[PDB]
Symmetry: C2
Subunit: 528 residues, 2 copies
C-alpha cells in the first residue's frame, strides 16, 4: 500500500496490487511516456511526455493504438485473443511496469517486452502478456510499451520531414530511454536491460541491435519466431512511397507536404479501413523502411558488417511457424476442416506463400518441397506448404541471423518450442502455430481461472527460469547446476539448439539446415 | 563329340566342349557373321558374311576390335580385366554361341549379351563374360557378338554415304539377324530372344528398343547400369562432325569424301592413338549420333512417344555407380589412398563430373549435394561427388527410362546390386563400382580356380536363376513358388525395386527419387 506510490522524472504515480497463487506483485499500468501523437503530430517521431502535477492513475491499462481488427471468426478465442481489448485511440503511448512485492532492495534486472502483430496490430494490454506471473516467480522487473502500428506507425514518404517512416520504432526507443531514466525508481537496474519480443516484436528487437542510437539502451536480446532480415519485416523506399500514395488515393487525397496534410485530416478509422487493399500471406502494408536513417543500410548488410562482441542473444522458433497463415489466403484451406489440399492447390498456394518471384523461382520451391514418392498426398502437401511459408518467413531468416551473430562475437542460444497447449482452439492439423509459446513464457498456465494441466504448470516455470537466467547472466542455464541437462551455445559450425517441451532438454544440430541453404544460398542467385 | 559339328546358313563349323563343375557345355567361339570391314569398308555398315566351303574352326575366340588400352596401372586386375585379351584387328566381326550338352531337343530360349565399355572398348572374349556357367546351370542358349568400337564403330560425318555413323550399332543388328537365321541349329528358339548388356551395352539394348528395324529381332530386354538417354550415350550431328574433323586434323588429314578417303589410309593404331584428345569423366569421343536414320529422333523423344505394350524389361544399377570414374580426372583422387578430398577439390570436381553447364547449373549441383551440417567432411565429400557422377550418368537416366516404360505399357522389374565381391581389387572406399555385378550374373564364382566364397557361389546361382526366369517367361520370379520372397514390378507410382545381395530380396521404393527429380525435372529449366 506504501509500495503503490512512486515518483518518476515526470511526477507522481499510483499503482495496483495484483494477485498470483504464489503471492502479490505491484503493477504500474498506463504510464504516459510521450505526448499524444495527434493532430499535426500524426506521422511524426514521438516527443517526450511533459511533466505533470498531481498523481497519475496507473491502475488500469490505457488505450490500444489504432489498428485493423481480425473479424473472420466472431467469438473465436484463437483469433480474438490477439484483437484490441481496450478502446482504440491515437492517444496510446503508455507503458507498464510490473515489480515484485516487496520492492527489491538492490538494483534488479529488467525484462522489456515488445509485442508482435505484423507491425499492423498488437497491444501491451493483452491477457496473454500479463507480467504478473513472471515477476512474481522470478523477482525480475518487467516493462511493456505500446508503440504505434500500421499507417500511424509506418507510413513513409522517404526523405520528407512530414512522414519520415519508422516512427513506431522511435516510439519503442523513447520507451527504452524512459527505462533508463526511471526504472531505478521501481527497484530496477538500468545497466541490466534484456529486450524480448515475438514475431514483429522480434524483428523490432533485431532492428534495435542494428541501430547505433538504440544499442546504448540495453544489454541483451531475445528474438522469438522473428528477425529483422525477414522478407516481410522491411520494405524499400520506392515501395513505401507507392503504398503511401495508394492509401492517400483510397481516402481521396489529393507534392508530399500536400499529401500528408490531407492525410492528417482523415479520421483514424478511415485510414484503418483501407490498410488492407494496398498490397499473398505473411505480408503487411506498413512495415519499417530502409531510409538511411534509423537503419543506415539493409538489415542484411548491417548484420554482415556488424561486430557483436560482448552481447548475449537467445533466439528460437515454434514447431509449425507457417501453419496458421495458410487459412488467410491459400486455396483449399479452412480452419474448420482438415485442409487436405490437392496438388493443383499446392502449386497455386506456393505463389501465394512466396509472392512475386520468377516462375523459375517458384518451380525450384516446388521441387524442393515435394516428396517424389508421394507427390500427391494431400496431408503431405499441407505440411509442405506450411513449411514453405514457415521457412521462408521465419526459420530461415532467424537461422541466418543466429549464425552470423555467433561467427562475429556474440554468445547465442537457440530453441525450438514443441508443446501444443492443451487449451489451443486452432485445429489439430496446425500443430504448434506462430505465437503459441508466448503464454508459457509469460507464466499464464499458473492463473487458476484457466484450465491448463499440472505438467503444463511445471513446464511454464522452467521456461520462466530459462528466460530469467538469460536476463540475469546472459546464460539460460541454471547458474551453477549440473545434472539439470545442459543447453549449449549455438555456433555457425555445430549449429546446436534445444527442444522446449514437456520432456527434459534434448540437444540437436541444424535449424532446418538443408532447407535454409536453399532459401539463404541458392534462391538469391535465381531471382537475380 | 557328335554335338561339336553344326551347319548354319554359311556352312559348317566345329565347336569345343567346355567344363563346369556341374558338367559340360558345347561352345562355338569365333563364328564370322560379317565380311571383314577393312580397306574401303572401314567406316561403312557391315555386309553379311559370304558362305564358305569346308569346316570353319570355332574352338577359340577371334580378334578384339581396335581400341584404346587402359595402362594407368600395369599388372592391376581391376583395370586389366577390361583390356583386350586377343590380338587387336579390324577383322573382328565374329560371334560366339554356347549351348547345353546334350543339345536341347525343343527350341530353347536365347540370351544375347552386348558388352559395355563406353563404346570405345570391350570384347566378347573377356574372361568375365564366359557363357559356360550360365548355360550349364540354366540350360539356356547364350550368344555374344563383337561389334566395332571407337572411330571404327562411331566416327560420323552426318549425312555422308562414306561415314554415316552408328555402324557399331548396325554390327550388333547384323548379329541379331544372324541369330534369327541360325540359332535354331543350336537348339535355340528364335521366337524367344532376350537382349542383355551393361554400361554401353545397356545403352545399346536401349537403342534397339527405339529402332523399328531392330524391334523385330528380339522379345525382351535387360539394361544393367546404363540407358540410351544418358548424357554420354549419344551426341549431336554438329558435335560428331567437329570430333571427326579434329581426329582427321590430328593424323594429318587433309570436303567429306576427301576426309574419309584420307582417314581410310591411316594405320588403325594411328587413329586409336589420338582418340582421347578430341573431347571431363564419363564422356567418350565416338558414341552413337542422332542422325534421323538408326534413330529418327533423340532417345528421350522416342521414349516419350513410344508404345511399349507387350514388352518385358529388367533394369538395375550397382550401389556405387560413380565411384571408379573419379580416379580418371577428379582432383584429389587416387586408387591408392583414401581419396579424402577437401571442399575446394569437391567444387572443382563437380565441373569435371558435370562438364560444360552454366556456373548457375554447377552451383545448384553443389547445393543439392552438400550436407550443410558437414559441408567440409572429406569422406562425405568423396561419397557425394561419387553420387553426382553416378546419378547424373547412370541412376537418373535409368529411372527416367524405367518409369516412362511402365507408364506406357511395359512390364518392368528393377534392382540395385549391393554385394562387394570378396575378391575385388579396387579400394574399399569405391564400394560396389560400375561393372562389378557382371561376374555374378555370368556365374563366374563357380570356376574352382577362382577364390570366391561359398555364399558367393549360392548368390551367383540365384542371380542366374532370376536372369534365366526373366528370359524364359518375362518374369524373374520363381515360375510358380511363394514363399521365396517376391519381386514386384516397378511402376511410375510406387517405384518398387529389390536389393540383390547375400540377404534375401528386400523391397524398396524410389530409385534415388529426390535426386532424380533434380536431374530430371529441375536442372533442364536452368541450362535453358
Amino acid at each position: 500500500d506504501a509500495e503503490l506510490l512512486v515518483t518518476v522524472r515526470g511526477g507522481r504515480l499510483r499503482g495496483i496490487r495484483l494477485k498470483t497463487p504464489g503471492g502479490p506483485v505491484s503493477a504500474f499500468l498506463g504510464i504516459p511516456f510521450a505526448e499524444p501523437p495527434m493532430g499535426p503530430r500524426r506521422f511524426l517521431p514521438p516527443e517526450p511526455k511533459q511533466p505533470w502535477s498531481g498523481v497519475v492513475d496507473a491502475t488500469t491499462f490505457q488505450s490500444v493504438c489504432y489498428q485493423y481488427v481480425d473479424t473472420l471468426y466472431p467469438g473465436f478465442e484463437g483469433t480474438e485473443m490477439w484483437n484490441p481489448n481496450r478502446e482504440l485511440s491515437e492517444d496510446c503511448l503508455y507503458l507498464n511496469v510490473w515489480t515484485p512485492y516487496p520492492r527489491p532492495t538492490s538494483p534488479t534486472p529488467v525484462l522489456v517486452w515488445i509485442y508482435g502483430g505484423g507491425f499492423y496490430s498488437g497491444a501491451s494490454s493483452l491477457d496473454v502478456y500479463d507480467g504478473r506471473f513472471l515477476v512474481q516467480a522470478e523477482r525480475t522487473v518487467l516493462v511493456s510499451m505500446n508503440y504505434r502500428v500500421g499507417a500511424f506507425g509506418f507510413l513513409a514518404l522517404p526523405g520528407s520531414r512530414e512522414a519520415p517512416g519508422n516512427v513506431g520504432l522511435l516510439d519503442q526507443r523513447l520507451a527504452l530511454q524512459w527505462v533508463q531514466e526511471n526504472v531505478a525508481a521501481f527497484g530496477g537496474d538500468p545497466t541490466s536491460v534484456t529486450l524480448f519480443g515475438e514475431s514483429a516484436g522480434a524483428a523490432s528487437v533485431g532492428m534495435h541491435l542494428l541501430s547505433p542510437p538504440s544499442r546504448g539502451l540495453f544489454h541483451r536480446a531475445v528474438l522469438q519466431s522473428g528477425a529483422p532480415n525477414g522478407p516481410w519485416a522491411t520494405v524499400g523506399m520506392g515501395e513505401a512511397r507507392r503504398r503511401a500514395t495508394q492509401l492517400a488515393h483510397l481516402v481521396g487525397c489529393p507534392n508530399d507536404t500536400e499529401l500528408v496534410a490531407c492525410l492528417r485530416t482523415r479520421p483514424a478509422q478511415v485510414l484503418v479501413n483501407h490498410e488492407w487493399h494496398v498490397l499473398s500471406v505473411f505480408r503487411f502494408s506498413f512495415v519499417p523502411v530502409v531510409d538511411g536513417d534509423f537503419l543506415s543500410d539493409t538489415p542484411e548488410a548491417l548484420i554482415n558488417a556488424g561486430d557483436f562482441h560482448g552481447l548475449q542473444v537467445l533466439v528460437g522458433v515454434v514447431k509449425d511457424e507457417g501453419s496458421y497463415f495458410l487459412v488467410y489466403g491459400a486455396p483449399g484451406f479452412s480452419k474448420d476442416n482438415e485442409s487436405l489440399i490437392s496438388r493443383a492447390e499446392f502449386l497455386a498456394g506456393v505463389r501465394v506463400g512466396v509472392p512475386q518471384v520468377s516462375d523459375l523461382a517458384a518451380e525450384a520451391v516446388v521441387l524442393h518441397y515435394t516428396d517424389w514418392l508421394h507427390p500427391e498426398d494431400p496431408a503431405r502437401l499441407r505440411e509442405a506448404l506450411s513449411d514453405v511459408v514457415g521457412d521462408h518467413n521465419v526459420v530461415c531468416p532467424v537461422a541466418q541471423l543466429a549464425g552470423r551473430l555467433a561467427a562475429q562475437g556474440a554468445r547465442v542460444y537457440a530453441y525450438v518450442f514443441e508443446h501444443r497447449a492443451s487449451t489451443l482452439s486452432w485445429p489439430l492439423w496446425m500443430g504448434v502455430p506462430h505465437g503459441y509459446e508466448i503464454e508459457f513464457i509469460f507464466g499464464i498456465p499458473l492463473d487458476p481461472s484457466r484450465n491448463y494441466t499440472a505438467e503444463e504448470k511445471i513446464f511454464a516455470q522452467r521456461l520462466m527460469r530459462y528466460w530469467a537466467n538469460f536476463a540475469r547472466t546472459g546464460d539460460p542455464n541454471e547458474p551453477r547446476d549440473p545434472k539439470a541437462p545442459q543447453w549449449p551455445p549455438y555456433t555457425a559450425g555445430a549449429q546446436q539448439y534445444v527442444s522446449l517441451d514437456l520432456r527434459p532438454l534434448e540437444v540437436r544440430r541444424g535449424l532446418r539446415a538443408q532447407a535454409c541453404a536453399f532459401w539463404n544460398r541458392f534462391l538469391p542467385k535465381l531471382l537475380s
